[PDB]
A paper describes a structure:
Pks13 is a multidomain enzyme that performs the final step in the synthesis of mycolic acids through the condensation of a long-chain fatty acid (C24–C26) and a very long-chain fatty acid (C56).12 The product is transferred from Pks13 to trehalose by the Pks13-TE domain. Pks13 fulfills a critical function for Mtb by performing a condensation reaction of a long-chain fatty acid and a very long-chain meromycolic acid to form a mycolic acid. Pks13-TE is a validated target for the development of antibiotics for Mtb. In previous work, we identified TAM16, a potent lead molecule for Pks13-TE. X-ray crystallography verified that compounds from all three different series were binding deep within the active site of Pks13-TE, displacing the side chain of Arg1563 with atoms within about 4 Å from the catalytic Ser1533 OG.
Pks13-TE was preincubated with X20404 (series 1) prior to crystallization. There were two molecules of protein per asymmetric unit, each bound to one inhibitor. The crystals diffracted to a resolution of 2.1 Å. Unlike TAM16, which inhibits by blocking the entrance to the catalytic center of Pks13-TE, X20404 binds closely to the catalytic serine (C23 of the X20404 is 3.25 Å from Ser1533 OG) and engages more extensively with the enzyme in a hydrophobic channel that likely binds the alkyl chain of the mycolic acid. The channel occupied by X20404 was not completely visible in the Pks13-TE-TAM16 structure because the side chain of Arg1563 blocked it. To accommodate the R2 group of X20404 required the displacement of the Arg1563 side chain, and an entire segment of the protein from Thr1645 to Gln1649 is also shifted by approximately 2.4 Å (as measured at CA of Thr1645) to open the channel compared to the TAM16 bound structure, as shown in Figure 3C. Four hydrogen bonds contribute to the binding energy through the following interactions: O29 of R1 with NE2 of His1664; N16 of pyridine of R1 interacts with water connected to the backbone NH of Ala1564 and, through one more water, to the NE of the Arg1563 side chain. The Phe1670s side chain, which flips to stack with the benzofuran core of TAM16, is positioned to form edge-on pi stacking interactions with the R2 phenyl of X20404.
Author numbering: 1451 to 1591, 1593 to 1727
Write the structure that this text describes.
């Protein structure tokens, strides 16, 4: 049921059967979030979830892609993801295409670019932690002037490690389980900011919510603004958008996921017909 980083949501038949849907985890979550979607897909559609691994987006896809090929060989490949999972799906599609594999569907569930690029600068690191520090005041009581000089030369992992170490040495002992949920959620979402998105030659459906929910905007304000194409237009010539309304956070759940599943079911149906 769990094999390394692959979760079986519905096992494919022993031989033959329908084309599997590969789904990819969101930041801070498992691919159990795709069970509602599975319920809205055709009967006996296999689904395998790719769970968290370490590295940049590119390094994560470098681990996923060999496993995908082990499982599905030449294709067809159907790759689907919400949130971070959308970025991982796309990154895998890129890698699979470089290897000559047949990617037939990429389904992005409101995986939408920030309205402006996240600067990778010392100034931005300073500004970000000042914002977070001010919020943390209202939470677990005056933070001492952030030691920016150490902070600004660290990656996202080291930033969080430095801050967690400051908290620890200041007296507050956080349960490891809370540290882990918060830490991975934070870092896995931040990994997106420096994703090296390449142009893709195949079909992508973007299921487009109306807006990012407030917590995402508090995490990163530049998510307050989004473009109609979610930033994908310049990368994807064959881009279809399915408007689904609502907020990013709700896109993965009933009732909105019914709209995603209904559309994606037709795409899967066409793929299955074509295989004759
Ligand atoms: C850097 O280069 C590029 C080039 C092109 C791109 O797309 C065309 C993108 C790109 C793509 C997709 C996304 C993206 C972000 N997210 C989820 C974000 C989130 C979700 C929940 C939360 C939360 O609530 N908390 C509490 C942390 C906080 C943040 N999904 N897709 C971002 N950038 C990036």
């Amino acid at each position: 049921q769990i094999d390394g980083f692959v979760r079986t949501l519905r096992a494919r038949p022993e031989a033959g059967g329908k084309v599997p849907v590969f789904v990819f985890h969101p930041a801070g979550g498992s691919t159990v979030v795709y069970e509602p979607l599975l319920g809205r897909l055709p009967a006996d559609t296999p689904m395998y979830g790719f769970e968290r691994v370490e590295g940049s987006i590119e390094e994560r896809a470098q681990q996923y892609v060999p496993k995908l090929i082990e499982m599905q060989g030449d294709g067809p490949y159907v790759l689907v993801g919400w949130s971070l999972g959308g970025v991982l799906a796309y990154a895998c599609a890129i890698g699979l295409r470089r290897l000559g594999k047949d990617v037939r569907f990429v389904g992005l569930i409101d995986a939408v670019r920030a309205g402006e690029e996240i600067p990778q600068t010392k100034e931005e690191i300073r500004k970000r932690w000042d914002r977070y520090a001010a919020f943390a005041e209202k939470t677990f009581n005056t933070i001492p002037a952030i030691p920016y000089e150490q902070l600004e030369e660290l990656d996202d992992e080291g930033q969080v490690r430095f801050v967690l170490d400051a908290v620890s040495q200041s007296g507050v002992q956080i349960p490891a389980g809370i540290i882990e949920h918060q830490r991975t959620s934070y870092l896995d979402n931040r990994a997106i900011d420096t994703a090296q998105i390449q142009p893709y030659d195949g079909h992508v459906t973007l299921y487009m919510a109306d807006r990012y929910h407030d917590d995402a905007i508090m995490f990163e304000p530049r998510y307050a603004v989004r473009q109609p194409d979610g930033g994908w237009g310049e990368y994807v010539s064959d881009l279809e958008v399915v408007p689904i309304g609502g907020e990013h956070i709700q896109a993965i759940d009933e009732p909105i996921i019914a709209k995603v599943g209904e559309h994606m079911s037709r795409a899967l149906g066409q793929i299955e017909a074509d295989r004759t």
